[PDB]
Amino acid sequence: KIITKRPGEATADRSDPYGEMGFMSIKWYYGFMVFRPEWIALLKTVARL
Amino acid sequence: DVGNITAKMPTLTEIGGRVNRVGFKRVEIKGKLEKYGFFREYTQEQLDFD
Numbered sequence: 001k002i003i004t005k006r007p008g009e010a011t012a013d014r015s016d017p018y019g020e021m022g023f024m025s026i027k028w029y030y031g032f033m034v035f036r037p038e039w040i041a042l043l044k045t046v047a048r049l
Numbered sequence: 050d051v052g053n054i055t056a057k058m059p060t061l062t063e064i065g066g067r068v069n070r071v072g073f074k075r076v077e078i079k080g081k082l083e084k085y086g087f088f089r090e091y092t093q094e095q096l097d098f099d
Contacts, residue, residue, distance in 0.1 A: 015066070015067065016064075016065050016066045016067070017065070017067065018061070018065035018066075019065070020063060020064060020065035021064065021065070
């Protein structure tokens with residue numbers, strides 16, 4: 001999701017009556033599910049022999 | 050004066066903000082009214098025998 005506010009009339013912003021600032025933001029959701037966890041293998045080793 | 054005008058000009062930067070505010074005023078004017086008059090008196094004998 002992308003929200004863009006460009007400088008100008010769209011940012012009247014009483015605390016700044018000229019609207020010389022703008023911004024843009026991105027936002028999303030994420031989730032993870034696992035089926036059959038026994039099918040994933042991990043080996044933890046040291047490096048650099 | 051040139052110096053005072055230059056030193057108080059409304060300059061603006063990139064960020065803007067609450068940087069320049071002004072105001073306005075009004076006043077009132079009045080009027081009045083007065084009454085004047087005067088009168089005169091006389092008698093009848095001071096008219097017929099003149």
